[PDB]
Design a binder for this molecule. Structure first.
Ligand SMILES: [Zn+2]
Lengths: 242, 242
């Protein structure tokens, strides 16, 4: 359910990009309320969301590898690794160029799943607003777990998902001796289609089977898709960027 | 105006902390709309907002000082300082205790205004959800500018402000040779009463006059209060407690 200013946007035709139509159909037909001050905001969400999907695929194909925090590394041209495994942007290096380098020189990098989701958000935003505005607004950067610089991010409870969402497969009786499998952060790329850093581009059955192979002795509870989604707040981004 | 699950809340008696009565009345009487899924959720916001105020006051009195990023330092028991000026929680230090140390050992710290706001949000959260939930959720921490570990923070346009809001006095024609005076991030403690890391607890005139003293030659644009507020997203957070 899309609302602009105050008008319910019914199927009212538009000269917009094809790869945006599937998402827009979802957003119009769902009972979920999407409120925007203007059409420009709506279009920003559509492009931003599909750029999240495209960025996930870019990262997937980059050659960037999975590593635990203590085994994290990155291109020293742009990033310093802290003792704890944080990727610190080096003094006065331009954020856009440093973050794009993850996509362009993937083999020089390895990091965790959460850090990968944040990288993806930044790449998508860069694709959406351009290097200059990104660099003006998100001017200091450390990539580490769920750290983000200024991004307005929220998590809501419920069953309705949209392209570009960040979802989570939980593994409740995971093997305590292998905490790396307590669950999996993913980008929703398409229907039953997910990017999961370290696993690849997979469907839900595959992700669930994988987690279930790393449970404790006697575990009966299967891994499952949590009913929640993690999302960028588009109206707030308009304040933060333009 | 407060609405829970679809029902307006007018004066209805309640057995709640007196400290919360003012803010609640203010939130019922305002034309802005606060929506919740439960009474618990509303109570969480009241406590969180009042703990933001208390946390600002605590940082004010702690002895922690203002410093630039390149001059930022912290208690090396818990924090390392990156070359760029990020305070990084050391490997396996308990997050709640390390963050609380900023209040209990203030003279061992100095950091800038955005970092100060984020610290205040963590301190307030610890007081609102408790150490166990905090450490479970916010298990890795780097304090640096507007970096957040998982915090759901948004900025909205408007001119109705409430206790605990984070506001911004902009100095549009700041002296370029004194870039720290581009503006001041503040927490609203009461009517025309603000905490400003580095200035203390000031009224709006005092902040503006101070900013105005650091402008370019002949500037005719006064520093002024922006019509926006930065806020923690309660339903995103409240997920943690229930
Ligand atoms: Zn050390």
């Amino acid at each position: 359910m899309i609302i602009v200013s105050g008008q319910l946007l019914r199927p009212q035709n538009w000269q917009i990009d094809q790869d945006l139509n599937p998402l827009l159909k979802e957003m119009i037909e769902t009972p979920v309320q999407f409120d925007y001050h203007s059409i420009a905001e709506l279009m920003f969400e559509l492009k931003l969301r599909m750029n999240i999907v495209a960025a996930a695929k870019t990262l997937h194909k980059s050659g960037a590898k999975f590593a635990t925090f203590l085994k994290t590394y990155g291109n020293t041209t742009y990033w310093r690794v802290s003792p704890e495994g944080a990727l610190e942007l080096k003094y006065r290096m331009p954020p856009s160029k440093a973050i794009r380098d993850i996509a362009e020189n993937g083999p020089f990098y390895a990091f965790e799943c959460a850090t990968a989701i944040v990288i993806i958000y930044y790449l998508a935003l860069i694709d959406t607003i351009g290097e200059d505005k990104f660099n003006a607004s998100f001017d200091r950067i450390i990539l580490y777990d769920w750290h983000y610089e200024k991004l307005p991010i929220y998590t809501e409870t419920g069953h309705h998902f949209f392209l570009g969402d960040c979802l989570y497969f939980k593994n409740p009786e995971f093997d305590p001796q292998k905490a790396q499998w307590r669950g999996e952060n993913v980008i929703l790329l398409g229907e039953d289609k997910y990017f999961a850093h370290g696993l690849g581009i997979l469907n839900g059955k595959q992700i669930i089977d994988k987690l279930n192979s790393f449970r404790k002795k006697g575990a009966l509870q299967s891994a499952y898709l949590l009913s929640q989604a993690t999302r960028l707040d588009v109206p707030s981004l308009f304040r933060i960027v333009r």
